[PDB]
Design an enzyme around this catalytic site. Structure first.
Site: not given
Lengths: 240, 244, 204, 226, 195, 250
Positions: D1, D17, D19, D33, D47, D129, D166, D169
């Protein structure tokens, strides 16, 4: 007048709605109970003069409350549907909590309690049905006969009639039955109930419905041919 | 007698016969005719429409006929306004029962419960009786095809054939006279169309004035198949029966 | 053992050309005791198909639940249940128990009746609305299944090709699962009709 | 994220992103998203996934209700307020943490909202994150009064630092640019690193490899009235 | 105690139900059969935790009886078993669950078909050739898989039952003190001559 | 005057037709002449507005309120009952279809939910019927353009054409003569203006006349372009200037 109130106690001591209930019982079918030493015979009118009526799915006037508790009624069919339902639930309630099978005498009281309750609570009509609750007590084989009234009370008679032309039937019950001795045989007892009903039906095989209830959960409704047999025998006597 | 008392359900008429209930009859009869004929090989429901305007789209409205579930359909006559509460509850109640026992509702059950709300409003609550009569057309395996009627009072009686709403007497005199006891399903459609043409103002019994459905046990492999006929299939069958 | 994985079960769906498939194994176990060789869990509301994995009593509950709600839909609105509306419907319910979520994995598969558009969507315990149209997997052995479905599947499959592909995906995961092994059923769902095939596979 | 928010002069640009992951397994290759509270109020959610969709749907309606009730496009702060109270009640078990962005007649805004109930304003914010990675670019290059053009590069490049560091992501970057006085320009798939590649070898099975024990054809189709 | 067995044969449903009532480490009673007659054609045996056993069993009995009388129509056995599954599916989500395993045998009079439903505690109902509940059931599932054939007469159904009984007593340290076996069939409910 | 039974809404009227419900219709008549015409490719709704005080702003008096961006409403009657009823329509719809089925209602379903509210202000005693009768004109995908009337009783009916208010008699006959559904929408707008023009001839200026169409999507007014699949708004309200253009086409 005081027909608009229930709470208002009335110096007449008689609330008109209560009087009007009685008018309603009269109009309904005649329903009769006459008890032997070992049986209750319930002879009742069920109308069937209605054209294009499928008789099979039309509800019989007699409704099994319990396995050995039966009800016949005179007065408005709609209003009567509420008593049958409360009384059925309470039947099974009794067993669930006391284990004991339905005490008939409790049940007589339970039912009358409802017609009483509604006399006190404004905004709830008193029902214009009178009923016959008949059964056989736990651990007993003596027949039990009760009537309830829309006055919210109950009483036991040796034999009783309610509904249209009850005046006519009452003379018969005085002279052919006795409190002192009920007809000892089941057979005697059934034949007289047929003769009583004939006085107001004036000849009908399915207009007359006979349900005999015996002790120990024995419910059987007499065969149309047998009913027909009571009639013919009686009708031979009438011209003698 | 003179002073007619009827404000509340609880308040009795002197007569003892609640006037609010009396007024209910008038209302039922206000609406046009509906007719249920139960046959040994189906049920036929046939009715003349309430509506009559051509501007108002008669075609898409099957005001009389709503299905409550896959086996049960009801024909409705009376007070539209009041009626709308009861049709909706009936569908949910049917689906509540199917939830519980995972079997279709028995016809007899579904009527007796609805009748009991109708009583409920006279027994307690000033609340008017909801003065509506349905003809229930249903099937269960307890008694086969079953037909019922419901009184505003809150009681029911079975019937071999019945008429509701307006001109009940005339349609009734004809049905009983030419009644064919066994009753074939083809026959019932013919017989129904004859009765409606005589009670319906248009004596050519236009399609646009007609609602029709047939519920058939005569549907392949012995099963119950409800089919709402549209105005275009009514028209095709009108020319088959020859009134037009 | 969390209540879902006591009863496990698997569902695997793929879209093909003018068709969808929804398929499952037939093993019902509770722990070490397998309980029935033959047991269904894919049901249909109209042309829309829903298989449901997870805790068995909750499966039964939700199936009733949705049957109730979807009946009202087709009656009031006067049109068949679509997959698109139906995906939202499954989602709404699932969320109402946030805390202590239904222990289930629902899978929608069906074809929109307005354009033939093949539609699949999945769900987890908590109401996630997964929009993969390639494939959807669910159950305990979901992880296994994904790994089959990602190599075998190819964009654009002829109906008769799609039937072989999904079957090998279901079968080999089955034998690498504990709580699966007994029998199989494939629904191949086309706009015209449904063919339902009970396969022959190895049995413990 | 990784989610970013960058104010620019004549608006604001939000990116995140596509994914999606459920655990360490990739659930969806693409699924945006970025969610729509209203046409010019967009937010991107982090979250618990389930909660983020649900809260947006429930609140969505009330915002829509507001709009029509008042015959006026609600304030960006109005969405902010309503969102904050909801979460606060449950003391954050409902775990939606969101970047709330939008333009309205009042002007351009960029806020963050956390499940506990804390808010901030930022010129440039990052959430997820991958907040740590995206910000680092932002803080090293950002100047006062970036152009729209410049915001859009800085922004996208920042998402790339998230992607590579990440695991969660990944795939296409989707962007919604909300500008004063104009319909939001949703730039679907602005950025593409790479996509699914066909396997070297075919996994086509000749028919009759599957065995067919029995067959029963279901008819969902209408049995004849005849 | 921990055992309730059922076997659905050709022309009947046969139920065997434990006589032991053990409330801790003492056998308070060794005879009472843990069953409640729901209909003359439907029998429910039951097992589970103290207190929940008696309340539930009798609550179910009442509901089926009420139903039976209201319409004067004996509800299908299929309907009865669904009833119980729902009441339980409610319980497990409620404040207080009812943890009772039941075998519901009914002989459908009309379709002249024996039908045995295994409803485990959860509210997982399945219709099977044969079933059991508890740990006890595992031991016996093999003898039933092998020796069962549809063509087993009612009488052959008794025979297999005795052999299962014997195995259960051997490898369980707890003896369930023999079984009262009753037959649910078109005649109604009768108690086997011997047991 | 009437009975105490007929004023009561908990009491079956002698006739069985409430006095109440009849009062609601007398008021509908007293209001503006509002109409609806159904076309192949659109629906046009059109009405005249109250002139009110000279210095009262006319714009703020709105007799067409959008319920959703794709479905509008028009009424004859009082302002207060209109606004309260209108908040209730949107609100009940969100709960029962924008969160459940996460989408805008079919026109039929929205019409069904509006009748139910109506029905409850007639059932409950002591709460008068909504003072207003609607036309709900709308567009949804499934059942195309659609045209409705919702009565303060809580009965609803689809029509080819209907008009309400004082000039209902006049208007309905005019639509019949000149038009049928199969005709295009463009023709109906010119026709509808003329029809409403019988009603009043002192002013017909586009200030005092509110005219709208529900028709084709406008992908411009979607407002979050760059995504095409979402339907734009079906409804587009036509400005005064736009009316005036349509007056020189008549």
């Amino acid at each position: 007048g005081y027909d608009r109130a229930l709470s208002i106690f009335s110096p007449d001591g008689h609330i008109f709605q209560v009087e009007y209930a009685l008018e309603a019982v009269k109009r309904g079918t005649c329903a009769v109970g006459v008890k032997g030493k070992n049986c209750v015979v319930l002879g009742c009118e069920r109308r069937s003069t209605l054209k294009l009526q499928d008789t099979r799915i039309t509800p019989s006037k007699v409704s099994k409350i319990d396995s050995h508790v039966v009800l016949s009624f005179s007065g408005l069919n709609a209003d009567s549907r509420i008593l049958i339902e409360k009384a059925r639930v309470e039947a099974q309630s009794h067993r669930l909590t006391l284990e004991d099978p339905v005490t008939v005498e409790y049940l007589t009281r339970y039912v009358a309690g409802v017609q009483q309750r509604y006399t006190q609570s404004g905004g709830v009509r008193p029902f214009g049905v009178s009923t016959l609750i008949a059964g056989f007590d736990p651990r007993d084989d003596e027949p039990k006969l009760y009537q309830t009234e829309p006055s919210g009370i109950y009483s036991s008679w040796s034999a009783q009639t309610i509904g249209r032309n009850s005046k006519t039937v009452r003379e018969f019950l005085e002279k052919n039955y006795d409190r002192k001795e009920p007809p000892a045989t089941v057979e005697e007892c059934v034949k007289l109930t047929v003769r009583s009903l004939l006085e107001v039906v004036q000849t009908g095989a399915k207009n007359i419905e006979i349900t005999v209830v015996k002790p120990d959960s024995d419910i059987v409704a007499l065969s149309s041919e047998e009913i027909n047999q009571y009639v013919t025998q009686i009708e031979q006597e009438k011209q003698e | 007698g003179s002073r007619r008392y009827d404000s509340r359900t609880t308040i009795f008429s002197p007569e003892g016969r609640l006037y609010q209930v009396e007024y209910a009859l008038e209302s039922i009869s206000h609406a046009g005719t509906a007719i249920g004929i139960m046959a040994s090989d189906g049920i036929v429901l046939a009715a003349e429409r309430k509506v009559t305007s051509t501007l108002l789209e008669q075609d898409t409205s099957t005001e009389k006929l709503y299905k409550l579930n896959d086996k049960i359909a009801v024909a409705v006559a009376g007070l539209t306004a009041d009626a709308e509460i009861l049709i909706n509850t009936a569908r949910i109640h049917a689906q509540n029962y199917l939830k519980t026992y995972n079997e279709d509702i028995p016809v007899e059950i579904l009527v007796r419960r609805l009748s009991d709300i109708k009583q409920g409003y006279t027994q307690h609550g000033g609340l008017r009786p909801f003065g509506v009569s349905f003809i229930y057309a249903g099937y269960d395996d307890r008694y086969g095809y079953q037909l019922y009627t419901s009184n505003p009072s809150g009681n029911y009686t079975g019937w071999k054939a019945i008429s509701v709403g307006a001109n009940t007497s005339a349609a009734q005199t004809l049905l009983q006279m030419d009644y064919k006891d066994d009753m074939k399903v083809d026959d019932a459609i013919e017989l129904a169309l004859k009765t409606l043409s005589k009670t319906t103002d248009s004596s050519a019994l236009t399609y646009d004035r007609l609602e029709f459905a047939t519920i058939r046990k005569g549907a392949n492999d012995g099963e119950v198949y409800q089919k709402i006929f549209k105005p275009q299939e009514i028209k095709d069958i009108l020319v088959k029966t020859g009134i037009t | 053992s969390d209540p879902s994985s006591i009863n496990g079960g698997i569902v695997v769906a793929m879209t093909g050309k003018d068709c969808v498939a929804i398929a499952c194994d037939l093993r019902l176990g509770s722990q070490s005791l397998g309980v029935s060789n033959k047991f269904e869990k894919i049901f249909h509301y109209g042309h829309v198909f829903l298989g449901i994995t997870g805790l068995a009593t909750d499966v039964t509950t939700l199936n009733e639940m949705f049957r109730y709600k979807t009946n009202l839909y087709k009656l009031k609105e006067e049109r068949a249940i679509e997959p698109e509306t139906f995906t939202q419907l499954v989602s709404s319910s699932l969320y109402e128990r946030r805390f202590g979520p239904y222990f289930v994995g629902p899978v929608v598969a069906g074809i929109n009746s307005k354009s033939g558009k093949p539609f699949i969507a999945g769900f987890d315990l908590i109401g996630c609305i997964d929009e993969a149209k390639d494939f959807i997997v669910s159950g305990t052995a979901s992880d296994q299944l994904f790994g089959m479905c990602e190599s075998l599947y190819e964009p654009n499959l002829e109906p008769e090709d799609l039937f072989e592909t999904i079957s090998q995906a279901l079968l080999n995961a089955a034998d690498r699962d504990a709580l699966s092994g007994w029998g199989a059923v494939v629904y191949i769902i086309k706009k015209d009709e449904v063919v339902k095939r009970y396969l022959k596979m190895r049995q413990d | 994220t990784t989610i970013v928010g960058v104010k620019f002069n004549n608006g604001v640009v939000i990116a995140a992103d596509t994914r999606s992951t459920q655990g360490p397994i990739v659930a969806d290759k693409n699924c945006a998203k970025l969610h729509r509270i209203s046409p010019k109020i967009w937010c991107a959610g982090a979250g618990t996934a389930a909660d983020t969709e649900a809260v947006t749907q429930l609140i969505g309606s009330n915002i829509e209700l507001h709009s029509l009730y008042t015959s006026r496009e609600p304030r960006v702060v109005s969405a902010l307020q309503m969102l904050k109270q909801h979460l606060f009640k449950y003391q954050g078990h409902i775990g939606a943490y969101l970047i709330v962005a939008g333009v309205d007649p009042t002007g351009s805004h960029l806020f963050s909202i956390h499940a506990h109930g804390s808010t901030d304003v930022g010129y440039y914010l990052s959430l997820g994150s991958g907040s740590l990675a995206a910000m680092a670019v932002l803080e090293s290059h950002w100047k006062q009064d970036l152009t729209k053009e410049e915001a859009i590069k800085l922004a996208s490049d920042a998402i790339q630092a998230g992607i590579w560091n990440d695991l969660g992501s990944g795939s296409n970057v989707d962007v919604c640019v909300m500008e004063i006085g104009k319909d939001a320009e949703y730039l679907r798939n602005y950025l593409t690193p790479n996509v699914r590649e066909e396997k070297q070898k075919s996994y086509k099975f000749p028919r009759g490899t599957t065995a067919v024990l029995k067959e029963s054809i279901v008819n969902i189709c209408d049995i004849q009235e005849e | 105690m921990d055992i309730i067995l059922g076997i659905r044969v050709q022309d009947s449903v046969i139920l065997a139900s434990s006589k032991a009532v053990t409330r801790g480490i003492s056998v308070l009673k060794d005879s009472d059969d843990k069953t409640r007659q729901l209909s003359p054609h439907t029998l429910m045996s039951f097992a589970g935790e103290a207190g929940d056993t008696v309340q539930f069993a009798e609550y179910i009995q009442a509901n089926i009886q009420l139903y039976s009388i209201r319409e004067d129509y004996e509800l299908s056995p299929q309907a009865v078993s669904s009833f119980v599954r729902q009441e339980l599916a409610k319980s497990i989500r409620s404040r207080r669950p009812y943890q009772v395993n039941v075998l519901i045998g009914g002989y459908d009079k009309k379709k002249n078909k024996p039908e045995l439903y295994q409803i485990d505690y959860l509210g997982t109902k399945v219709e099977l050739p044969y079933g059991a509940h508890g740990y006890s059931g595992f031991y016996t599932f093999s003898l039933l898989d092998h020796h069962y054939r549809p063509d087993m007469t009612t009488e052959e159904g008794l025979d297999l039952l005795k052999l299962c009984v014997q195995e259960l007593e051997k490898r369980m340290p707890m003896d369930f003190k023999g079984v009262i076996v009753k037959i649910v069939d078109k005649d109604g409910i009768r108690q086997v001559d011997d047991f | 005057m009437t009975d105490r039974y007929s004023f009561s809404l908990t009491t079956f009227s002698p006739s069985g037709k409430l006095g109440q419900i009849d009062y609601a219709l007398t008021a509908v008549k007293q209001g503006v002449t509002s109409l609806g015409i159904k076309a192949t490719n659109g629906v046009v709704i059109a009405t005249e507005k109250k002139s009110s005080s000279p210095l009262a702003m006319s714009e703020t008096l709105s007799k067409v309120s959008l319920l959703t961006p794709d479905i509008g409403a028009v009424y004859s009657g009082m302002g207060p009952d209109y606004r309260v009823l209108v908040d209730k329509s949107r609100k009940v719809a969100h709960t029962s279809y924008k969160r459940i089925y996460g989408e805008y209602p079919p026109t039929k379903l929205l019409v069904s939910e509006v009748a139910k509210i109506m029905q409850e202000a007639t059932q409950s005693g002591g709460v008068r019927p909504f003072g207003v009768s609607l036309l709900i004109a709308g567009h949804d995908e499934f059942n195309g353009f659609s045209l409705y009337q919702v009565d303060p009783s809580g009965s609803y009916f689809p029509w080819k054409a209907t008009a309400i208010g004082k000039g209902s008699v006049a208007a309905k006959t005019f639509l019949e003569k000149r038009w049928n559904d199969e005709l295009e929408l463009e023709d109906a707008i010119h026709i509808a203006l003329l029809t409403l023009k019988e009603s009043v001839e002192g002013e017909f200026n586009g200030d005092t006349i509110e005219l709208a169409i529900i028709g084709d999507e406008n992908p411009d007014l979607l407002g979050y372009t760059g995504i095409p699949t979402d339907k734009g708004p079906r409804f587009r309200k036509l400005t005064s200037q736009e009316i005036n253009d349509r007056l020189e086409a008549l």
